[PDB]
Amino acid sequence: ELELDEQQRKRLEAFLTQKQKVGELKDDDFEKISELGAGNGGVVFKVSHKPSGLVMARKLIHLEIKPAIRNQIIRELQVLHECNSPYIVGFYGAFYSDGEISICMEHMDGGSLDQVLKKAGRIPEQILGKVSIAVIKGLTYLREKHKIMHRDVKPSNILVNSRGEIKLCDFGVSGQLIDSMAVGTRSYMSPERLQGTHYSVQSDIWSMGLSLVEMAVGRYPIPPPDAKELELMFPMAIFELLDYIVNEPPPKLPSGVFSLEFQDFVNKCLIKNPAERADLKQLMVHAFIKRSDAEEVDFAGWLCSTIGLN
Numbered sequence: 448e449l450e451l452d453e454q455q456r457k458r459l460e461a462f463l464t465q466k467q468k469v470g471e472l473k474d475d476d477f478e479k480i481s482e483l484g485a486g487n488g489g490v491v492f493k494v495s496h497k498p499s500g501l502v503m504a505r506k507l508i509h510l511e512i513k514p515a516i517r518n519q520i521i522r523e524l525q526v527l528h529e530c531n532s533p534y535i536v537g538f539y540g541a542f543y544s545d546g547e548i549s550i551c552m553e554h555m556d557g558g559s560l561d562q563v564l565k566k567a568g569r570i571p572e573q574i575l576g577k578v579s580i581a582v583i584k585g586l587t588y589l590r591e592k593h594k595i596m597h598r599d600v601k602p603s604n605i606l607v608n609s610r611g612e613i614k615l616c617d618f619g620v621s622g623q624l625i626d627s628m629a630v631g632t633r634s635y636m637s638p639e640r641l642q643g644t645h646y647s648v649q650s651d652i653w654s655m656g657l658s659l660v661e662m663a664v665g666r667y668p669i670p671p672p673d674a675k676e677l678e679l680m681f682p683m684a685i686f687e688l689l690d691y692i693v694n695e696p697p698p699k700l701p702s703g704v705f706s707l708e709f710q711d712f713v714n715k716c717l718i719k720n721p722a723e724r725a726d727l728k729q730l731m732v733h734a735f736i737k738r739s740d741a742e743e744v745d746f747a748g749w750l751c752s753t754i755g756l757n
């Protein structure tokens with residue numbers, strides 16, 4: 448899982464070689480190309496780094512804070528330079544300028560999976576098999592190589608591109624940034640996290656499981672759809688919704704339309720007891736993942752056709 452093929456090794460080396468040419472990121476060295484979309488507490492733009500000519504994704508987080516606080520956030524974000532993986536979005540740098548922190552990243556031309564889902568309606572099982580592999584490996588990388596968990600897996604934090612790559616972003620690195628921003632949705636949080644009890648990487652596995660169900664059925668799955676709505680397919684307030692997650696049984700895929708391997712996979716992800724819930728090691732050898740890994744699915748081609756990359 449941690450071991451890479453030669454295509455992934457070549458691309459990661461190519462990213463770093465280009466990154467070494469960039470140097471120190473400055474506010475005036477960026478030109479706006481387009482707005483990509485309003486995300487977690489800030490607007491993300493597609494931008495050109497004028498000196499290097501590199502296209503980037505730039506998230507601007509508007510905050511009014513003193514030089515002490517903001518300079519601590521920039522040094523905390525420097526660990527993202529070390530997070531080098533085919534399943535983690537590339538980091539160029541971070542800086543402060545005129546009342547707003549900037550985070551500059553690798554541009555992913557396919558966007559996030561909430562955008563792809565909204566375009567697709569629902570995502571096919573075999574496509575979600577490749578999504579599952581990438582999230583597991585991305586989470587395995589952060590945990591093994593950095594002793595880090597994500598803390599915020601959701602469709603908007605899974606980015607994709609026309610080269611067929613699927614990557615994670617917005618994992619917890621800066622404690623001070625979360626303090627100063629305090630925001631994001633808690634609707635993908637695990638029941639034990641919403642109860643404020645012993646939570647770990649198992650909490651991200653729930654979030655993946657729930658995200659996969661949403662992408663599979665084409666709708667955030669809590670509360671469950673009706674028997675009539677499932678036939679048509681194939682309002683709770685946020686506080687009422689978070690109480691439902693803690694108190695009611697977990698969501699499941701509908702039977703018949705998905706394979707029992709995929710149903711079992713998401714079920715093992717959504718067991719409410721984190722001890723009983725499957726771990727990354729167990730999920731990596733799961734029947735769904737083994738089958739998915741063997742399947743030669745053209746994700747890039749599927750993506751481009753679905754979102755209209757001409």
Ligand SMILES: COc1ccc(-c2cc3c(cc2F)ncc2ncn(C4CCNCC4)c23)c(Cl)c1
Pocket residue numbers: 483484485486487491504505506536550551552553554555556557558559603604606616617
């Ligand atoms: C650390 O915090 C982040 C998180 C994500 C990105 C990020 C977003 C992108 C992107 C690349 C990226 F690195 N590429 C294409 C694209 N299209 C739409 N979006 C966003 C629209 C709002 N919803 C979330 C995705 C993005 C950045 Cl820069 C910083």
Ligand SMILES: [Ca+2]
Pocket residue numbers: 474475544
């Ligand atoms: Ca300026």
Ligand SMILES: [Ca+2]
Pocket residue numbers: 475
């Ligand atoms: Ca200036």
Ligand SMILES: [Mg+2]
Pocket residue numbers: 487599617631
């Ligand atoms: Mg977040």
